[PDB]
Amino acid sequence: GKSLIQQRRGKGTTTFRAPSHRYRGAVRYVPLNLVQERTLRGVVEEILHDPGRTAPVARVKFEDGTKKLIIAPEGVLVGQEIYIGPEAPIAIGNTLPLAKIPEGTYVYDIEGVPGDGGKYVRAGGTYALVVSREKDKVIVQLPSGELKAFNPMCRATIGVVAGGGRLEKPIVKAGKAYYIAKARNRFWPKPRGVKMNAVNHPHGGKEHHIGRPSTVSRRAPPGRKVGHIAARRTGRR
Amino acid sequence: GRTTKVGSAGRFGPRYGLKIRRRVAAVEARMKQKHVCPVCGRKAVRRISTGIWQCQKCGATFAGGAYLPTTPAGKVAKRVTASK
Amino acid sequence: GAGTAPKGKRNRTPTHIRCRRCGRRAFNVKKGYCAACGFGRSRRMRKYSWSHKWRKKRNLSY
Amino acid sequence: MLKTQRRIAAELLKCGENRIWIDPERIEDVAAAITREDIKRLIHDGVIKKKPIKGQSRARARAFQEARKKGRHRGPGSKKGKKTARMGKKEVWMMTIRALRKELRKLKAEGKLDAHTYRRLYIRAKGGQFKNKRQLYMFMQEHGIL
Amino acid sequence: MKPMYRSRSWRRKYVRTPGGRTVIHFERRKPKVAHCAMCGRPLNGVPRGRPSELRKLPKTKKRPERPYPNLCPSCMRKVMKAQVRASIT
Amino acid sequence: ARNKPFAKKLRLAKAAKQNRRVPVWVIVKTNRKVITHPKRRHWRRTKLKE
RNA sequence: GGCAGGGUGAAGUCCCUCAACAGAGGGAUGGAGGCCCGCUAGGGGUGCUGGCGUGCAAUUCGCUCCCGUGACCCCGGGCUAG
RNA sequence: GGGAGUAGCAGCAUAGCCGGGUGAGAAUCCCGGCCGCCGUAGGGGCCAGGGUUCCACGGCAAUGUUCGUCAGCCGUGGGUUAGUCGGUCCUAACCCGACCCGUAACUCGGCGUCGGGGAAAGGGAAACGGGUUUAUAUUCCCGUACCGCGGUGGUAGGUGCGGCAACGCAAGCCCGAGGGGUGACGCCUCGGGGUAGGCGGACCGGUCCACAAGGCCGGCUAAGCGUAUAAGCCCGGGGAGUGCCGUAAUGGCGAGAACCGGGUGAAAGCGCGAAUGGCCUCCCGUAAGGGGGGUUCCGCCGAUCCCUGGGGCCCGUGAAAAGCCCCUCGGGAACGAUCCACCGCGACCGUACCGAGAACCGACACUGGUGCCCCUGGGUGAGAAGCCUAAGGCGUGUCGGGGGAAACCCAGCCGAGGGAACUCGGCAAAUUGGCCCCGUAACUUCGGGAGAAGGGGUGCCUGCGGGUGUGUAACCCGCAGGUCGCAGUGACUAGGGGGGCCCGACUGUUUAGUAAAAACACAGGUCCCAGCUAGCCCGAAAGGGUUUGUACUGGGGCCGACGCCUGCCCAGUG
RNA sequence: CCUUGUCGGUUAAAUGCCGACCUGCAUGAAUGGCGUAACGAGGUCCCCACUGUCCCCGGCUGGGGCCCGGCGAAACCUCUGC
Ligand SMILES: [Zn+2]
Ligand SMILES: [Zn+2]
Ligand SMILES: [Zn+2]
Ligand SMILES: [Zn+2]
């Protein structure tokens, strides 16, 4: 037969590739190497829109003139002083190890293993909650409802990510959706497989209907995983 | 203000449906008005981009919500972090 | 349609130009290699057994 | 042959070739002329001339304009565009309000208005209730401003 | 018109010749005025020009004679006052 | 005015020099056995390889 | 690198009058839109089941019709190969 | 060979006639005149592509849909001149090499490091006018300039000033470092200041017109050098709320308004260049050549060209680097320029012509395509519309001559009485039509429907008033009266309307070449997997896409704007 | 399916269109059900106006066709041809 769109995505062509050359740099923490226990200080110069971040970034000038990017917290001003390190105070925009952040605090941009740089709760409008502290692990509620354990030396930032409420206003036009999907080149517009031919999809045929259950095993090979993949249930409730 | 029921959504006529027109008009009417600055305390704050707000008199520039400078989670975080 | 009219759009830049090693017009100008001798892709000559070109050039039997 | 002379003479005389003239009693002398020297000599003599441009008078148009200025040819049967297209929309307002503000400043400088009345009249004019200076003056007279 | 002059980065001009020809001239565009480092205001005393126009000028005709010409007078007074107030002890 | 690479220009010059007929004394000397050669070419019938 | 000219008139910003427990009327400014007319340029291809059908043409011509500031049209440099 | 001396040499731009010439020979070549076509392209300029088709002389065996004395054909000789135009320099998306890992191996596959390439329309030192040739010219000659490098001699300065300030100044040399600016940016909309071009009046010359009145032609000024204001932004004084100040509009003010002064700061214009230079015209032998004159003023419109400022939109944010200017610091010598004057030097390649109804691709001197890529005078007029016309180009959208010479076909005009009886079907054709005023339904998502429907008027002449404006300048808005015709948006331009039903919500897309749709997409609704060494995917592996990403996220299905709703069954298959 | 189902309206005349009735061969709720303003070179029925569509055809214009000069093919062809 012929290939699927998700099979063609794996080969890595311009039709499926991200235009990262349009984006501001990557957002990472300073390494622990330079922050053994130094507790640097910085000042915010400017706040900027990023086309590949779903959140605004802020530029910060540090001890030695170095300029870094950060995910901007809600409420941050130009001309603020932000601190990174163990003896930093508890204030919106400051980065601390999870072992110095009390229970009940809102946190974002958390590391999985220390030194990583930031992996979880980065998206516009998100926040996480510290639930419990211990000597072996700290426990955090994530925006999916999942409770996860981190090493207490993993770093995190205090506050909430800026840019929330994007989805309260509707997209009204195919043209606006065109521009939105062209910013980050997502595959748009989207076809339906039940309206393709048989060579093209497990669905497909002159009579436009799925002729067998949409639920598909976890152990099915590529070319077949379409529909509801390993679904525990279906329907509304 | 010539219209009774419609507002900023009169730009695209009888298209796209009632619920959607209402929602757009409401959001835009809440957004486009002026807001109080957290620095000088005057109603001079407008939106510059998605999530970036600026006062016209003092020049204060801060990060906030997409369509309103504040969010509920932001309010609660401010309160909790001020106390503890 | 697909015939006489599209033939008018052959005033762009050419797909092949002359090769410095081979001599003939088979050097792909955008990829940087020759389709007849391999220049720009290999130090050695392009030479396949199913081909008749080099045998013809040397007046050889197939 | 004579195309050479025609084009060279057109270049030398700064005109079109369809505006050059060659005397038909001299085609042998003109064919014997191959150099630009020879061609310039023949031009100086008068065997090759440059005809004048043909004109296209505008004297019918002059008369039409004079009659229209004195009031003819401007009735409901001669208009093809809309009224807003024949006279602007924003231009009318521009000229009106500029005239009004100029006149108000002139009066305030000559001393017949104080700042309170000047300001109230400024605000009225911005609101757009006068539409000309005679209406402004009438309002001022029927109130107690003068 | 050549394709390089069909570019709109050349600001053409119609010019009449003593011989009466009305030729077209082309020029490059002038760069914009200098701005302050922090405030972003336009600087005074610094003229606009391309490298050609600016290299046929002496030094003292390219910036004012006062400290911190890269700044506006307000910012300059600020930094001077801060320096002198730090230089008390 | 019209932009050319130099080696291309030289190849074109050669192709132009090539395009003329057999001289007359060759025909006389061969007794009418050599009259043409295989590189006559008109600019509007058979194209070069650029 | 491009898209003649014209229409309608959203938000935003206001003015006047009588008033007055309430309210009731009347005038402007401003220029949005996958809006409108349009053989501007440009693009497309509905009907005549027209001409042609060893053709001007191995898919063209004419009349009629559609879009025409946008999910628009086009150019130079690049990428995806049975 | 027959078909046949037949078809075709029409249709989309119907074009030739008179006189003279050349020549063996002229419907078809040259000169003049009359008559015509194009005229926001059939005119002008120039990419790619082509490659000598360019120029002159001499020819007509073949080519050219006919002829040909002609020629993009044939032959013989010629022709492309740069310190300033472009390439070379920078980097963009992207590509290559070496090392490295994989592969039985490779001319195969791949991450990271180093290095190198990558734009003749992106960034980016520097020249304008006149003349000259058969054919080249911002390249040659004359005149008047500029840029870089290297020097010669002086000077500012080292070791100096004026201003409350904003600022104004010639305001030291040589190496390196750091910082700031510039280069450097989207879409829509509006104001101001200018220019190209055009219109009117006077005057000077020439020309056409039975006189007169009148009409047409010409009346020019480059780079460079030197000179200023506008907006905006600043500096001093000043000291305000029942408020004042201002814009086309938004607006501004004790976080310092009005008001008074000043600084900085565009495109332009003015002056030198530069008037025996260019254009126009007037007088004797006509071979070189002689002499003389004119080159003036006012007033309007005005860009899609140039400069400068505001405002609005983004779940969308609209390049980088070289190069250039300034400041600070460190280290050196005692000299010495970013100022004035003079001298010297500046390599390599391109440069002819077409640029398309005959120089490109399509087998052709092909109604197609590439390129409409950039630009265009007057009238009517909303208008880059259609019609007429100036410049410029053509009569080569390369066969002609006859005719009451029919039938029939192609493209058009008119038709008495009736008015769809025609036909599957009002197919086709016809009707309406521009502008101003009156008047305007059901239904409705209150936005629309709507130019609904329907009705009345419009020319020419003689006058009277209004608006802005200094205007007997220009552009617009009304009134009365007189008069002609079958007919006054008189040509050109230029909607036939209404009432029901099915489908699809709409704008959009589709079977290049028999299907444009009820089919696709769409905003939106709902379901599924996934806490990152994840989920889904490519690959033989190494490695890789989503990922410069982290649940307001990424991936996978179905329905399909909006409104009211979405019932029962887990036995089977999963 | 029987089917031009039956009743009503539209015609002088109705295998049509619209509205209802249920005997649903073989409708039915996100393979969505029922409605819907605005929009459509979609499909279908009626009315006004208008007309050479038609009764019934007629006259005129330009280019071909016909003749003259010139250049000059092809498809096709067992031999023939009441
Ligand atoms: Zn503020
Ligand atoms: Zn080769
Ligand atoms: Zn500043
Ligand atoms: Zn400042």
Side-chain angles (χ1 to χ4, degrees):
Chain A
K2 281 177 99 192
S3 314
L4 310 163
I5 285 155
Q6 64 183 347
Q7 296 180 289
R8 293 200 287 120
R9 186 187 276 102
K11 293 186 176 293
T13 45
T14 59
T15 299
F16 293 103
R17 204 194 285 161
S20 302
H21 46 271
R22 280 177 205 163
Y23 303 168
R24 277 88 166 83
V27 171
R28 314 272 180 249
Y29 285 144
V30 301
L32 286 173
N33 187 359
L34 298 85
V35 187
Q36 299 272 311
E37 56 262 15
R38 274 220 315 278
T39 302
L40 300 176
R41 170 175 59 164
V43 174
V44 172
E45 302 167 80
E46 182 60 24
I47 299 152
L48 308 169
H49 167 282
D50 193 339
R53 198 76 46 179
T54 177
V57 301
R59 184 171 288 132
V60 173
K61 219 203 277 175
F62 278 109
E63 181 188 7
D64 294 331
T66 54
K67 285 161 203 182
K68 300 250 188 216
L69 290 178
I70 60 143
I71 291 152
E74 213 196 352
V76 75
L77 292 148
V78 177
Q80 259 188 37
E81 283 175 9
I82 59 160
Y83 290 94
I84 320 169
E87 298 294 299
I90 289 173
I92 284 156
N94 289 1
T95 317
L96 282 84
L98 285 192
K100 304 292 170 44
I101 304 181
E103 295 84 337
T105 310
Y106 281 17
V107 170
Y108 73 94
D109 194 1
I110 317 164
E111 302 178 315
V113 303
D116 264 7
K119 293 205 173 209
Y120 313 91
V121 191
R122 310 178 80 211
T126 53
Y127 75 83
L129 185 67
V130 182
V131 173
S132 312
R133 290 175 65 190
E134 278 100 345
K135 294 177 183 293
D136 54 309
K137 63 197 193 323
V138 187
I139 286 158
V140 190
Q141 202 183 7
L142 297 181
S144 75
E146 193 269 332
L147 287 144
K148 208 190 179 214
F150 300 82
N151 194 283
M153 299 321 291
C154 287
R155 283 179 297 184
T157 306
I158 281 149
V160 185
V161 181
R166 268 179 181 222
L167 309 179
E168 314 305 343
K169 204 171 58 150
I171 305 152
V172 180
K173 284 199 275 161
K176 204 149 181 288
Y178 168 82
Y179 291 116
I180 290 171
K182 189 170 169 230
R184 293 150 224 158
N185 73 327
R186 314 294 187 207
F187 204 81
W188 186 94
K190 292 168 97 179
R192 284 178 296 119
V194 76
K195 191 68 175 144
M196 297 182 192
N197 294 307
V199 289
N200 286 118
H201 207 275
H203 311 170
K206 176 176 71 69
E207 302 280 357
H208 43 264
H209 69 286
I210 318 161
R212 64 185 60 249
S214 317
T215 52
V216 187
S217 183
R218 181 77 74 180
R219 282 165 210 193
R224 183 65 188 84
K225 271 197 203 180
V226 295
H228 300 289
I229 297 163
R232 310 169 162 86
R233 66 153 287 145
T234 40
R236 287 298 321 272
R237 274 83 67 70
Chain B
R2 281 80 172 171
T3 59
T4 287
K5 295 204 161 167
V6 305
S8 79
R11 51 164 151 149
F12 54 74
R15 277 159 267 134
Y16 311 117
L18 188 162
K19 184 184 279 182
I20 282 146
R21 285 198 273 114
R22 288 282 179 287
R23 195 85 67 104
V24 172
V27 172
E28 292 192 334
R30 272 197 285 289
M31 198 171 90
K32 292 288 176 202
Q33 86 200 355
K34 292 181 191 77
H35 297 279
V36 171
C37 194
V39 183
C40 80
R42 291 176 286 195
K43 273 81 73 180
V45 161
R46 69 178 51 185
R47 196 180 82 149
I48 301 303
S49 283
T50 318
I52 308 171
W53 298 80
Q54 186 179 61
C55 172
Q56 294 197 258
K57 292 150 170 216
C58 67
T61 304
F62 54 108
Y67 310 120
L68 297 160
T70 72
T71 65
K75 293 165 216 179
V76 175
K78 183 175 172 67
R79 160 155 62 73
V80 173
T81 303
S83 177
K84 202 176 212 194
Chain C
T4 288
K7 300 281 187 175
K9 309 169 157 92
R10 272 152 199 248
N11 282 336
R12 325 278 196 203
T13 177
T15 302
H16 296 97
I17 64 179
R18 290 263 201 224
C19 175
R20 296 205 298 276
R21 176 162 99 186
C22 201
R24 61 191 289 133
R25 184 180 72 189
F27 195 86
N28 199 302
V29 71
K30 300 167 184 96
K31 298 293 182 66
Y33 67 80
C34 185
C37 83
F39 186 59
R41 197 180 81 229
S42 79
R43 320 162 164 186
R44 295 188 187 170
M45 282 286 165
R46 208 180 148 275
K47 196 174 167 194
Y48 293 103
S49 298
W50 53 257
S51 176
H52 299 152
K53 198 62 175 182
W54 55 278
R55 305 191 171 264
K56 273 187 189 161
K57 189 186 141 177
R58 276 159 72 185
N59 284 315
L60 289 168
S61 278
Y62 288 174
Chain D
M1 295 78 81
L2 272 68
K3 280 71 73 197
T4 315
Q5 283 85 15
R6 194 182 281 286
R7 71 144 190 269
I8 285 167
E11 281 166 1
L12 285 169
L13 287 171
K14 293 150 209 195
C15 62
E17 308 198 15
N18 286 91
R19 202 170 136 207
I20 287 296
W21 183 83
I22 297 155
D23 184 303
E25 297 300 325
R26 304 291 191 97
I27 53 185
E28 70 278 349
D29 302 323
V30 181
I34 64 186
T35 49
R36 305 185 152 221
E37 270 187 359
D38 296 8
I39 302 169
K40 289 172 209 158
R41 180 172 306 128
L42 292 176
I43 287 154
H44 194 85
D45 290 349
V47 189
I48 302 141
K49 311 196 200 156
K50 179 177 63 165
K51 307 181 216 174
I53 290 167
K54 176 151 76 174
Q56 191 174 348
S57 87
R58 213 185 156 275
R60 290 179 303 265
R62 272 169 227 140
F64 197 82
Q65 302 278 336
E66 192 191 2
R68 191 193 272 254
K69 291 167 190 26
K70 70 182 64 170
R72 291 86 170 91
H73 307 303
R74 68 161 164 98
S78 307
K79 314 166 150 40
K80 294 297 286 298
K82 317 272 289 166
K83 204 148 154 190
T84 41
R86 296 184 70 192
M87 64 179 182
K89 304 193 230 198
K90 189 186 172 99
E91 309 165 29
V92 186
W93 166 250
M94 279 188 210
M95 86 193 196
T96 294
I97 190 53
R98 277 172 185 154
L100 289 172
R101 299 187 172 146
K102 202 171 188 278
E103 197 57 30
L104 284 178
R105 270 168 215 124
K106 185 185 303 215
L107 283 166
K108 174 212 211 175
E110 294 189 13
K112 323 176 175 168
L113 297 159
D114 56 2
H116 181 256
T117 316
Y118 178 82
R119 183 56 34 186
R120 301 288 162 105
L121 286 174
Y122 198 90
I123 293 169
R124 290 185 199 258
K126 187 174 180 303
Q129 85 183 39
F130 289 133
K131 284 186 181 36
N132 60 62
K133 294 200 270 164
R134 154 179 64 220
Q135 280 190 30
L136 165 80
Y137 268 104
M138 286 180 182
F139 170 85
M140 293 166 81
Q141 180 202 20
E142 69 93 19
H143 277 70
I145 299 145
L146 265 178
Chain E
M1 192 176 280
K2 311 193 166 103
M4 48 177 287
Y5 292 136
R6 307 168 213 167
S7 201
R8 298 321 292 269
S9 81
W10 279 100
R11 61 180 293 258
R12 61 189 62 76
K13 178 181 203 202
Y14 284 93
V15 163
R16 191 152 37 163
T17 307
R21 302 293 189 68
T22 318
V23 293
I24 303 163
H25 281 167
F26 302 95
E27 290 86 28
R28 296 265 195 195
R29 267 141 192 288
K30 214 168 210 174
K32 79 191 159 79
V33 59
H35 284 81
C36 181
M38 61 179 77
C39 191
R41 292 299 221 276
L43 296 185
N44 307 115
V46 188
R48 304 173 52 203
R50 305 185 63 73
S52 159
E53 194 275 331
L54 291 177
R55 274 180 72 153
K56 53 180 88 187
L57 283 176
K59 189 203 265 185
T60 53
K61 278 174 192 173
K62 278 185 279 199
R63 86 285 180 272
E65 213 74 7
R66 65 154 171 79
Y68 298 103
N70 75 310
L71 301 173
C72 77
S74 200
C75 303
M76 202 274 288
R77 282 170 207 200
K78 279 183 218 150
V79 308
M80 298 308 260
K81 272 180 246 196
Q83 281 169 20
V84 54
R85 271 174 212 162
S87 198
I88 278 159
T89 187
Chain F
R2 194 261 204 280
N3 322 314
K4 293 190 195 52
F6 186 47
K8 207 206 184 166
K9 186 181 173 177
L10 301 166
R11 275 182 259 123
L12 293 177
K14 170 169 172 143
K17 289 180 297 208
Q18 257 175 339
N19 195 17
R20 61 169 301 247
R21 65 171 199 89
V22 173
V24 160
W25 56 267
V26 172
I27 306 175
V28 180
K29 178 198 161 112
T30 43
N31 213 18
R32 312 187 195 169
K33 297 156 205 218
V34 181
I35 59 168
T36 185
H37 61 92
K39 288 187 179 173
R40 295 316 305 286
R41 154 188 76 72
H42 189 256
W43 55 275
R44 215 172 179 178
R45 281 286 150 168
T46 298
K47 301 283 99 176
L48 299 157
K49 307 295 240 181
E50 197 176 0

